[PDB]
């Protein structure tokens, strides 16, 4: 279904009941990633996957992607499916959204199952690689998507990488508009920084990172768990950016783990 | 998006440029199980995934499942994206679906990939399974999916088995009745029968299966593909009943590779 937050339509899908959880997709694809979590986790809870603005199946609009923004838009889906409080499973700029969520919303949290994010990702990224990105879009993803899975992963799941790199190229996806506008808001998913708000975060956090991940470093998350107060950090061998098509029955028991 | 046909609206998504490919999901799934096929082939093609009617995002009535109405659905979705002529690929009751469409609408088709699928299936059912499957609903359903994974996907991938014991098991994805109902219809899934009507079937014709599917077995796909005029038979090893799963990258190869 669809709600609607300022004239911008938020794609949602929603199965199940009970305790309430939130998947929010990582950038530049959509809420399909989910898919081994979806279902199993609908039969014991209530899941809701979210496409964000400038994503998937949900509106493009020209401006308007500061985590902030995306964050009302969550909130629009849980106002519409009369929902107080949820379980926040963030991936990348999901995680930035989770916790954007936490500072303006702590309200409406249970808890946070952080997946391989971090906060002033922009100022940590090599400073050639912008230019790479200004240079040649769709290489540059392409060179930074290879530090997105493991070894192990490029040997045994192919189809993640192959399938991470179709998300990009596909306008009807990801417009280039949408990378432009989110690359160009002070709050956007690389501009976004909120280093000395982090220990206003109190809510049960559990930060989830993989080894070999290169978008996002094991120091990015490091960061995240040091400075949220009561935060566990859980540093996944042999997986990259997407623990949850990597190993996904492990991240579902992992999840599973955030219950009490 | 979604299309209203009979009155049941039928939830479709849509990607891409170029010729289109239509991908049908397995019975009691939904359009979701796509994910590793749809963003690669939506760089090359017009890609449209489906919800079948009783599955998913689409609406679910309680009466009727037949193949035909299920067919039509899909021709309703190719009306409103002003499509005249499609590549089919359909996974169990997919393949039926494209099978009947092309039976009924040859002039659709440019090409099939039948997956995994079969006719007159429920003469080949145990006796004794019938009445399994009200008694112990849940039981019997979870014991035919586990013959429809093969031993390697169940070793390296479980979370297939699991995604896959889920979609029953969550009423809002699949809910009982429609499972009744469809076993109830004189043409729905256990009862359509076309074996009469394969030497009809004159578009190029691919049709996939897995040496472990128990739920169709090798002999289930071979008559189709003995039957049907040029038909092509792909047997492939340790693969179950979902090929696009249990080795996706592998199943896009053949994909790309085969004539449509």
């Given at each position: 279904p669809?709600?609607?937050?300022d ?10 009941e009970?305790?309430p ?5 990582p ?27 400038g994503?998937?199946?949900?509106d ?8 902030m923004?995306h964050?009302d838009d969550?909130?629009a889906?849980?106002?519409a499916?009369?929902?107080?409080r949820?379980?926040?499973v963030?991936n990348?700029?999901?995680?930035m959204?989770?916790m954007?969520l ?9 808890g946070?199952?952080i ?25 540059a993803?392409?060179?930074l998507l ?8 490029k ?5 993640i990488l ?6 990009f190229?596909v306008?009807?996806?990801?417009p280039?508009?949408?990378?432009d506008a989110?690359?160009?808001d002070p709050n956007?998913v ?5 280093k ?16 070999e991940?290169?978008?996002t ?8 768990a ?9 540093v ?25």
């Amino acid at each position: 279904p669809h709600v609607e937050n300022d004239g911008v339509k938020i794609y949602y899908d929603s199965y199940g009941e009970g305790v309430p959880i939130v998947f929010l997709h990582p950038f530049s694809t959509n809420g399909g990633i989910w898919y081994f979590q979806t279902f199993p986790f609908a039969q014991t809870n209530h899941v809701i996957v979210i496409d964000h603005r400038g994503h998937g199946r949900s509106d493009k609009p020209a401006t308007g992607y500061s985590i902030m923004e995306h964050a009302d838009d969550v909130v629009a889906v849980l106002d519409a499916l009369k929902v107080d409080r949820a379980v926040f499973v963030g991936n990348s700029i999901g995680g930035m959204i989770a916790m954007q969520l936490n500072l303006d919303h702590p309200q409406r949290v249970i808890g946070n199952l952080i997946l391989s994010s971090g906060t002033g990702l922009g100022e940590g990224m090599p400073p050639e690689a912008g230019a790479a990105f200004q240079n040649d879009y769709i290489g540059a993803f392409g060179g930074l998507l290879e530090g997105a899975v493991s070894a192990r992963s490029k040997r045994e799941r192919p189809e993640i990488l192959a399938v991470m790199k179709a998300h990009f190229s596909v306008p009807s996806n990801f417009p280039k508009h949408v990378f432009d506008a989110a690359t160009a808001d002070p709050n956007g998913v690389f501009a976004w920084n909120i280093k000395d708000r982090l220990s206003s975060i109190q809510a049960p956090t559990l930060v989830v990172a993989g080894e070999e991940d290169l978008v996002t470093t094991v120091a990015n998350n490091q960061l995240l768990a040091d400075n949220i107060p009561g935060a566990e950090l859980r540093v996944i061998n042999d997986v990259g950016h997407f623990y949850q098509l990597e190993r996904p029955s492990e991240f579902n028991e992992l999840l599973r783990g955030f219950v009490a």
